[PDB]
Structure 1
Amino acid sequence: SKTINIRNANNFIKACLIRLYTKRGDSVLDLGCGKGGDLLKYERAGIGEYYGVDIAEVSINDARVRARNMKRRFKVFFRAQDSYGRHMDLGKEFDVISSQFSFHYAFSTSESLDIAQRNIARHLRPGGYFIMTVPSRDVILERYKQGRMSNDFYKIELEKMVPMESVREYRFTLLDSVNNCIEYFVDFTRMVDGFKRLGLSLVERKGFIDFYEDEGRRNPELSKKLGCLTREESEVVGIYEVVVFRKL
């Protein structure tokens, strides 16, 4: 693959995010878990329980097979359902709720973002954390203004016609990944506010490149266990940001 380093970075970043906010015996709710790659990261993290939820039943399947054939200490649970725009109640809270590269899908409509925020808040133990990695609207528009919105690895198109600050969705393509996939912008303020009203407060917001470099010059061990990036790959990785809220 040509995307390898980008995948390596992204996973590295995720593993770090997981290292920072998880502890042994912790309970995790993975929203938009996808095929379930993070299972390993969590297994190293030493958590005691993993609940994967994802609208795509095809992906849950993969995660089931994944969990079924891996070396893991934690118990697992999986469910194919919409955890953002449809009420969700699992009957229990979690120490940590994670949404990796998926929460922006919660922004389809004001109603949808709401149902999602409520679902998040009702499955989170008081004091617990809600970690995520979402595309940065601010970054995406500034690149828009710079004129460059693509390279050999990806492409982005704004569903415009009409202020760019008024645009709420765009098309995303990633080499060896999604194709012309439609994404919703993350209305950051509206998000923060909703969560605020729900008892969750913002405790962290940092970009992929800096966070990467920082955590990198912080433990060169997991790194080598990585490398450097080309300006091109860095543009892809430079799209996302880390965002954490905590239930107080």
Structure 2
Amino acid sequence: SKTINIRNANNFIKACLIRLYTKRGDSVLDLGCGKGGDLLKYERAGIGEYYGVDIAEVSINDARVRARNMKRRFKVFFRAQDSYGRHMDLGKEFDVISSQFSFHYAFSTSESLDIAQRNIARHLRPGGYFIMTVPSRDVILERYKQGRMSNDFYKIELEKMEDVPMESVREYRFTLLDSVNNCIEYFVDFTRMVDGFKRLGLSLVERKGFIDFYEDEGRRNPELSKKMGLGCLTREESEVVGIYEVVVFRKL
């Protein structure tokens, strides 16, 4: 109830992102699909097939039910496995691969990132898109320097000092009211990611902050904006939303 606006905002951003890169009869691969909270958004997008994959069986389970009890028109598929630090071969390619609030987990180790980016590349059709929403390292480090690493909605704490450069840290603890607790998150080495992808035939096509992206899409699509209590957002709520950014790669 307290994090309602944040959730609405986030779903909105995801709904818009999905809208911008999907078209009818499209095939989507949803990595880190969680409980399938995007099936509805994809239903409206008129997609033909949806493949959800998540490492946590408990989430893939709730996702199966959601798809099982919803009025959808697309063919669904779910699989509980590791799509980042373990090889993945679903035997097919998709038009759109989506990774919402999950791809930063692929930065566990250099090997994990490599495997992860390779699972993406072999499942993406030539011309396909890989849309994602990941925490922004720049934002997070800049907030660290300002001493504002938290509020009543969330809380973040980095690694140990002891001559350790602020740029040396690779992970941090993240907590979100009514959500994850002391969740270990890995920073997104942006450049390494771009490089890894550029080497697999995928190039950066988009990078925009949640807040900015939010403002733009809401002032362009006042329609889907009325579908919920959008419009404004307190300062404390923006803190949380302002953590993530939109990144979109494309397979030439």
Partner Cα distance (1:104, 1:166) in 2: 17
Partner Cα distance (2:160, 2:148) in 1: 16
* Partners of 2:207 and 2:246 within 8 A in 1: yes
Partner Cα distance (1:160, 1:126) in 2: 43
Give 3-state SS (helix, strand or coil) of 1:217's partner: helix
Q: Encode CA deviations 1:25-59: one digit per residue, 9 max, x unaligned.
A: 00000000000100000000000000000000000
CA drift at 1:165:
0.4
Partner Cα distance (2:160, 2:27) in 1: 42
Aligned-pair Cα RMSD in Å:
0.4
Partner Cα distance (2:221, 2:51) in 1: 29
Partner Cα distance (1:160, 1:215) in 2: 39
CA drift at 1:164:
1.1
Gaps of 5+ in 1: none
* Partners of 2:60 and 2:78 within 8 A in 1: yes
Q: Encode CA deviations 1:53-109: one digit per residue, 9 max, x unaligned.
A: 000000000000000000100000000000000000000000000000000000000
Corresponding residue of 1:159: 159
* Partners of 2:97 and 2:120 within 8 A in 1: yes
Partner Cα distance (1:107, 1:163) in 2: 19
Q: How does 1:58-77 map to 2 (within 5 A)?
A: 58-77=58-77
Partner Cα distance (1:238, 1:160) in 2: 25
Partner Cα distance (2:73, 2:58) in 1: 25
CA drift at 1:6:
0.1
CA drift at 1:234:
0.2
Partner Cα distance (1:228, 1:7) in 2: 13
Partner Cα distance (2:118, 2:103) in 1: 13
TM-score by length of 1: 1.00
* Partners of 2:128 and 2:250 within 8 A in 1: yes
Partner Cα distance (2:160, 2:214) in 1: 32
Corresponding residue of 1:112: 112
Give 3-state SS (helix, strand or coil) of 1:88's partner: coil
CA drift at 1:227:
2.6
TM-score by length of 2: 0.98
* Partners of 2:218 and 2:231 within 8 A in 1: no
CA drift at 1:160:
2.5
* Partners of 2:129 and 2:248 within 8 A in 1: yes
CA drift at 1:123:
0.2
Partner Cα distance (1:236, 1:92) in 2: 36
CA drift at 1:138:
0.2
CA drift at 1:159:
1.6
